[PDB]
Amino acid sequence: VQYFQFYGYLSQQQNMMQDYVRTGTYQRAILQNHTDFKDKIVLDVGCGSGILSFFAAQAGARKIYAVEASTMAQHAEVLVKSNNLTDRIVVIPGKVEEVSLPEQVDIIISEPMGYMLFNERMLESYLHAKKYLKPSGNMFPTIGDVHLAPFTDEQLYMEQFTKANFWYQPSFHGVDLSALRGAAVDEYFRQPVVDTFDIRILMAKSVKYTVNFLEAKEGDLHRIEIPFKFHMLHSGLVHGLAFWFDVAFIGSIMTVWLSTAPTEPLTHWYQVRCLFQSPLFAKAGDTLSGTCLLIANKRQSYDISIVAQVDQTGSKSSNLLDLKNPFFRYTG
């Protein structure tokens, strides 16, 4: 509930700000689309530091309502004063779903993307605020693609068992821990892995899943069924699925893309890998079918259910992951 404490620290805000791909692209998108802003009314949902509102101001917006739920709002307000933008940017402390704007807006801007795009469940707030949009008003970003794909990583699916095996000692300071080995394995396999990777570990082309923020409703995000049918370009043991995302700022003048793909430069979102507990053997030619099912939970996250089978063999694999507790493997 109070993960807003997390967003209160300037250090956390700094982290996002310093992601040049993230913050630069946002700026590019807005100023390169100045007509979507010149003397328009704006809603910045979750402004934090304010940076996005400050960009909307650069592009000529008349009025920008910058809503922030955390105590980061106080510093947003201090910033609007020293920049002398009190005439154009209004900070509103609170949640979008609880505060009241004095006016309908022309465009909504926000950076509500989490790991796997959906993590933190802020996109539901983004959508929630369409209640303030003027009809035919725009949203920045406008759409998001989630990509997923099969990977082969033997060493990653091995770290998992090497770790768990602490619990396979028959005499730790004289205690037999081996009865707990199974539960340890299970814990590590419930953890989505956060780092990047060589793109060569991929075994099929991604399949994408599109959310259009102009059309989608707040409740479309409680249950995200991602059906997949892969056509394996390479033979090997498949150790799980890799996920990444792209967002799109469709402006009047131009479409700008902010991509978090293994191919584009690295961002603070890295990529997310979900291991299978049973590797599937596939060969080039085969189809890897299943569905990835994302079920919104109480801890502002998603229960991930991944069912996959190789159509030719028929051998199958099913895994359940806990997105609120990931493993950050990124070191260098």
Catalytic site residues?
A: 19, 111, 120, 268
* Beta-carbon count within 10 A of 55 CB: 23
- Closest CB to ligand SAH among 19 and 286? 19
Starting from the edge strand earliest in sequence, which strands make up the sheet with 41-45, in order?
89-93, 63-68, 41-45, 105-109, 133-140
Amino acid at 144: G
Q: Does 133 participate in binding a copy of itself (rule CB under 8 A)?
A: no
Question: Residues 7-36: x/- map of binding to a copy of itself (CB under 8 A)?
Answer: --xxx--x--xx-x--xx--xx--xx-x--
Residues 6+ apart with CB under 8 A from 166: 177, 184
169: partner contacted, choices ligand SAH, a copy of itself, none (Cβ within 5-8 A by kind): a copy of itself
Q: Does 236 participate in binding a copy of itself (rule CB under 8 A)?
A: yes
Q: Which stretch binds a copy of itself (CB under 8 A): 114-122, 207-215, 221-229, 280-288?
A: 280-288
Q: Does 199 participate in binding a copy of itself (rule CB under 8 A)?
A: no
Annotate 38-73 with DSSP letters as a single string: TT-EEEEET-TTSHHHHHHHHTT-SEEEEEESSTHH
Q: Does 331 participate in binding a copy of itself (rule CB under 8 A)?
A: no
In DSSP terms, which residues pair with 316 in a beta bridge?
309
Structure tokens given for 260: 């978090």
Q: Give the long-range contacts of residues 172-179, CB within 8 A, separation 24 or more.
A: none
- The answer to whether the annotation marks 94 as part of a ligand binding site is no
- Closest CB to ligand SAH among 29 and 308? 29
68: partner contacted, choices ligand SAH, a copy of itself, none (Cβ within 5-8 A by kind): ligand SAH
Phi, psi of 177 (to 5 degrees): -100, -5
Q: Give the long-range contacts of residues 328-332, CB within 8 A, separation 24 or more.
A: 328/194, 328/195, 329/156, 329/159, 329/193, 329/194, 329/195, 330/194, 330/195, 330/196, 330/270, 331/195
Q: How far apart are CA 146 and CA 200, in angstroms?
A: 19
CB of 166 to a copy of itself, least distance (A): 5
70: partner contacted, choices a copy of itself, ligand SAH, none (Cβ within 5-8 A by kind): ligand SAH
- The answer to whether the annotation marks 182 as part of a ligand binding site is no
Q: Does 19 participate in binding ligand SAH (rule CB under 6 A)?
A: no
Residue 191 and residue 274 in contact, taking contact as beta carbons nearer than 8 Å? no
Structure tokens given for 275: 């291991």
Q: Does 95 participate in binding ligand SAH (rule CB under 6 A)?
A: yes
- The answer to whether the annotation marks 289 as part of a ligand binding site is no
Site of interaction with a copy of itself (CB under 8 A): 5, 9-11, 14, 17-18, 20, 23-24, 27-28, 31-32, 34, 49-51, 54-55, 58, 75, 78-79, 81-83, 154-155, 157-158, 161-163, 165-180, 183-184, 187-188, 234-237, 278-279, 281, 283-284, 324-325
Site of interaction with ligand SAH (CB under 6 A): 4, 7, 16-17, 45-49, 51-52, 67-70, 72, 95-96, 111, 122, 125
| Binding residue numbers for S-adenosyl-L-methionine | 13, 22, 46, 68, 97, 125
